[PDB]
Design a protein around this ligand. Structure first.
Ligand SMILES: [Mg+2]
Ligand SMILES: [Mg+2]
Ligand SMILES: [Mg+2]
Ligand SMILES: [Mg+2]
Ligand SMILES: [Mg+2]
Ligand SMILES: [Mg+2]
Lengths: 130, 130, 130
């Protein structure tokens, strides 16, 4: 039984791994909020999805990419006019081998997160085990 | 076999439970469009997701939160400039006990729904049964 | 084991089937990038989701609808002000019979896709087999 769901707590900005520190669900404890990464324990097929809230008045361009280790497997850009919020979101279905790390990276832009209201999220679960 | 998928039909606005009355899928009949709520029958792990379309020229701020009973478990805000649409969307993975209610609440803002075209949606399914 | 995940490569615009030609995952080879369609082989319950990136400065209105054969089962509209990107996204849970085709159609608007960076995506998997 492998499944997790976490949210973002503070304001996030610049190139970095988005660490979702508000962990709601984490069967098997495979998501590490100190790294922001999901580690594959069982070879198989996995679904992942993320929703990242962006602040307006921020230059204006926020990138949030789902990575499998060092490879971009999904991308999203958020960007809005006068003073406004928007979402950079995407979903994947990937095959993973034990040790593979899955996580969201922030490239530039202002990402909003709340103490415990989960406007920005990261979740996933295994669909098939090999 | 627990899974549902419903859409929104009319214009929705103000604080209220978003009742998705255009039900496409509803295995086990656990989603009630007269309440807009999904009721857990089987203890286990559940995935939920929602996409809510917002109208522009509307003041401009629409909140749509997924709730498990009286608790906010996911949030989204939509908001756009001159005359424009956008989405408040999010996804969760939650553990539920029999009786738990899962649903979307609208906080302020103009939510669009169509008679039978499903621009605004609510869906979910059980991943693991305890 | 039925699951797929594909992205969009070039710029897409006008009424047409969105062919996601950057296929990452495709168990059972049921997604055809030459048609852009997923063909049901096994009667059962299926989850689908799509994220379509739209360019700003484009008139400004992009529609992307998930279709089951010739029927609209989900809709999304993207639309943004000065020079800006946004997403038309939605998710479904549907019952399918062998032969049913599931795919995204583009109605008007500028859809962005990248050679191999997957800003615009299409994915899905079977939840229950009948
Ligand atoms: Mg990228
Ligand atoms: Mg809230
Ligand atoms: Mg926008
Ligand atoms: Mg948006
Ligand atoms: Mg979305
Ligand atoms: Mg339509």
């Amino acid at each position: 039984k492998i499944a997790f769901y976490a949210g973002l707590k503070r304001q996030h900005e610049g190139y970095e791994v988005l660490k979702f520190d508000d962990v709601v669900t984490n069967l098997g404890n495979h998501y590490d909020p100190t790294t922001g990464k999901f580690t594959c324990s069982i070879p198989g097929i996995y679904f992942f999805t993320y929703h990242v809230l962006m602040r307006g008045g921020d230059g204006t361009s926020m990138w949030a990419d789902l990575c499998k280790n060092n490879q971009v497997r999904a991308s999203a850009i958020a960007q809005a006019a006068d003073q406004n919020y928007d979402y950079a979101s995407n979903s994947v279905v990937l095959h993973l081998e034990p040790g593979d790390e899955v996580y969201i990276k922030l490239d530039g832009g202002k990402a909003h997160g709340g103490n415990n209201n989960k406007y920005s999220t990261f979740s996933g679960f295994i669909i098939y085990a090999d």
